Symmetry: C3
Amino acid sequence: AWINEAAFRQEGVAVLLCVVIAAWLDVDAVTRVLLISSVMLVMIVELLNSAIEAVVDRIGSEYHELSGRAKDLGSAAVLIAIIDAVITWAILLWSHFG
Amino acid sequence: RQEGVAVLLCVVIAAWLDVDAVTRVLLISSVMLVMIVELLNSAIEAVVDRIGSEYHELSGRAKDLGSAAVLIAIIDAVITWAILLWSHFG
Amino acid sequence: GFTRIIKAAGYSWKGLRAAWINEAAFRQEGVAVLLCVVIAAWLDVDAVTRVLLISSVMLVMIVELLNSAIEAVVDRIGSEYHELSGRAKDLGSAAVLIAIIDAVITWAILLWSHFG
Ligand SMILES: CCCCCCCC/C=C\CCCCCC(=O)OC[C@@H](O)CO
Ligand SMILES: CCCCCCCC/C=C\CCCCCC(=O)OC[C@@H](O)CO
Ligand SMILES: CCCCCCCC/C=C\CCCCCC(=O)OC[C@@H](O)CO
Ligand SMILES: CCCCCCCC/C=C\CCCCCC(=O)OC[C@H](O)CO
Ligand SMILES: CCCCCCCC/C=C\CCCCCC(=O)OC[C@H](O)CO
């Protein structure tokens, strides 16, 4: 039901492409696992974030400081996850094709 | 809890196999990740239920989203074990 | 598309800033994580090992943030004791601890192999 939204689609596709790319690369096994897991974690974390966003919104439209805060914190996690993935790919591919 | 059974076993098997430390860290973390995601999913369910037993579009949305996260974590785990065991026994 | 990023980035900054400003323990964890990343970056190890040392402490930060987000929600609903509120927090806290243990182990194991 949730898959049919422009934000999740654009997100799922990026990750999915990375997994596909990671499956084609001529890298050793552990590197391949690290390339795939890192981007999948992005998707996992984004899903939990959106889940939290849903709960907040479920409570209602009336703004509360802690409502904004839960979403910010959620967003921050997605950001750290993405940075983790960027760092992971950078280090492992530089090592490999550099 | 039978998740810890599945978990301990994965930890046992990973401990038993003659793999290097890096491989062993990945076999274990991939399983630990499923547990972290499940506990966070469960926490989100706890909150959805704390708000009300009554149905709401957004309450089900939250639960579907958390559940999809657990699934992706499980898939990540299966892929990790497949790839590493294939390579270990390659 | 461009704005989704810009918006989310700004929320992310507010989240980090809020977590930092509100708890000493969060700041101290941030210091620990940053020291760990820096050490991992300045260490004579292969790339995969470097990535594991780094991603393991990052995960700690990720689960810390998600869990604090859940706490924010619980606290938002009511200050009153409620079984499901205590439970949400208990579960979330379990998650954070596992992430931390996984990290300590990951570093213990990998640093043993390299140095020992
Ligand atoms: C060689 C190609 C890959 C290079 C390495 C980098 C790949 C891994 C990094 C990112 C993939 C996930 C991106 C998520 C989509 C996104 O931006 O979401 C923004 C908002 O929607 C968040 O709410
Ligand atoms: C002679 C043969 C030796 C090799 C035998 C290989 C056996 C592999 C056994 C287990 C791997 C499991 C990977 C998925 C982890 C997972 O699913 O975590 C549990 C949760 O999903 C529970 O909800
Ligand atoms: C590669 C490392 C990426 C990050 C790794 C994870 C650790 C992140 C640690 C802290 C998050 C940002 C903290 C912001 C600092 C802050 O709030 O100062 C006070 C001012 O706001 C007052 O006006
Ligand atoms: C986000 C969009 C990215 C778009 C990128 C476009 C350019 C293609 C780059 C890499 C693909 C893999 C290419 C290398 C495959 C490779 O290493 O193959 C060796 C062996 O033959 C494998 O068995
Ligand atoms: C129940 C079975 C689940 C099956 C899940 C499929 C996972 C797809 C991942 C990679 C595709 C490429 C194949 C990877 C094989 C492999 O070990 O690659 C590492 C090293 O490159 C080896 O040298």
